[PDB]
């Protein structure tokens with residue numbers, strides 16, 4: 001028992017982290033096979049970071065300008081190319097520590113582990129969710145660019161995020177491993193609206209099921225609701241509307257606790273309308289939305 | 305910017321995890337050099353787990369009874385010994401992945417990362433604190449025994465905890481790497497009082513400094529206090545008394561924000577006496593005590 005914001009073991013990803021230096025900028029790169037993936041803003045200076053012409057800036061660069069170091073060993077760059085907002089630096093040596101991997105684009109509301117890195121060196125690992133508005137509420141300082149987000153299924157690492165930018169609001173923006181930004185963000189130092197965020201309803205419900213599994217039951221009530229009535233409450237409190245697909249993904253947790261998804265929705269409705277009343281659920285005094293139904297089953301069953 | 309419950313990258317520890325099977329019990333072991341460390345209750349059955357005579361139970365065991373597997377390879381056991389509540393199984397091969405390491409006994413209120421494991425395989429990593437009452441509020445299922453807690457200083461892994469037991473209250477108990485239990489706990493399936501817990505005051509203050517560094521400032525007030533007045537409030541709210549050593553450890557955070565430790569104590573006093581008033585600090589609606597002053601500086605400066 002016990003419920004924690006658990007991240008995947010970072011070992012497989014630590015073995016892929018390299019340092020990428022171009023001109024005066026240093027950031028992190030991801031070494032998979034004979035390719036190093038890093039944010040394309042590694043080629044920028046402070047002057048052109050307000051409105052960079054990436055094509056023009058990359059034309060002034062040759063393979064020898066991209067200094068790539070894996071710990072204390074220098075990788076030899078034999079090709080470079082820009083794909084969307086990422087640079088792919090072909091190296092003459094395949095990473096001996098390349099795990100089984102995939103590049104995936106996650107959906108908003110899905111979760112992933114982030115291995116924060118500086119100068120190609122891992123500093124820490126944390127779990128987070130891709131917000132409905134495509135930002136991440138991470139913990140990143142200058143030099144963290146190129147740190148990646150991922151999920152692990154047995155031995156396969158699914159890379160879903162590469163960190164690029166911190167918005168003036170303090171939230172984080174980045175791309176998939178093909179360099180496509182999540183959200184409307186551009187790699188420019190400019191005002192960028194993150195857009196209205198919402199609470200991931202399906203995840204809060206999944207977390208309520210984890211709370212019941214782990215003994216926290218005070219919030220369970222004698223009521224039930226319908227998807228329509230619950231969605232009126234979700235509307236009022238800036239929660240994502242709940243669909244039948246969400247109810248279906250909550251099937252296993254509903255079967256495990258024997259608490260019908262709509263009865264759990266009525267518990268969430270009462271919590272939204274009345275608050276916690278100074279109480280806690282799984283050590284939190286607010287409704288937690290960074291655990292998916294899959295995360296809850298994974299943690300509550302012990303998949304390795 | 306951004307503040308997360310960050311765990312150390314688990315790579316160095318993942319490389320040490322093995323599976324240990326004795327009779328019908330399987331749990332995790334830690335392979336460092338030519339020694340495998342695991343909880344001594346691996347030699348128990350369900351019948352003798354109520355009051356085990358470990359010396360007697362271990363006498364019925366030979367080296368060949370301890371099945372140790374590292375992934376898919378079998379380690380050959382050439383010696384076994386009990387030290388307090390841990391078994392040390394000498395193996396004929398040193399772990400090629402042994403990192404630079406130390407065995408340390410942490411103080412209550414200190415933090416550490418836990419790599420939860422099942423059948424010698426890493427499932428996840430999370431950060432937690434050793435409670436003032438020597439329990440840990442972890443996330444562990446059956447088979448997690450032998451999962452270890454650690455801190456990392458550059459390349460040196462300091463192992464501080466080995467998981468042994470879940471109390472009937474759902475909290476966790478374990479030992480240092482010499483097999484000494486933290487707290488009054490014994491490796492017996494019996495009623496065990498965890499003792500009155502308290503909130504780690506120095507850590508809450510450190511977290512309040514992290515909140516100021518990361519933009520959350522609403523809680524700052526026009527007041528100050530003394531250690532005596534603050535300790536009267538800490539007494540009333542079951543917070544650990546604040547000492548000059550704690551004030552001294554908060555020195556760097558006090559210097560960084562320019563907010564005197566006693567002025568921050570007055571902010572904490574107002575929060576304790578009035579609550580959050582439905583507001584949040586670093587995404588939490590309660591006062592967080594799982595970040596030490598060192599953790600806050602580490603995360604806010606980016607040490608790798």
Ligand SMILES: C#Cc1cccc(CC(=O)Nc2cncc3ccccc23)c1
Pocket residue numbers: 041049140141142143144145164165166186187188189305
């Ligand atoms: C795309 C892009 C882009 C645009 C301008 C500038 C940059 C650089 C940049 O935003 N890097 C950082 C990322 N994370 C956290 C940080 C915290 C403090 C300072 C910098 C941070 C990227």
Ligand SMILES: C#Cc1cccc(CC(=O)Nc2cncc3ccccc23)c1
Pocket residue numbers: 001345353444445446447448449468469470490491492493
């Ligand atoms: C010392 C000791 C001792 C005494 C009796 C029994 C055991 C076994 C034991 O407590 N293992 C577990 C540890 N963590 C979480 C668990 C969750 C569900 C079931 C078992 C769990 C150890």
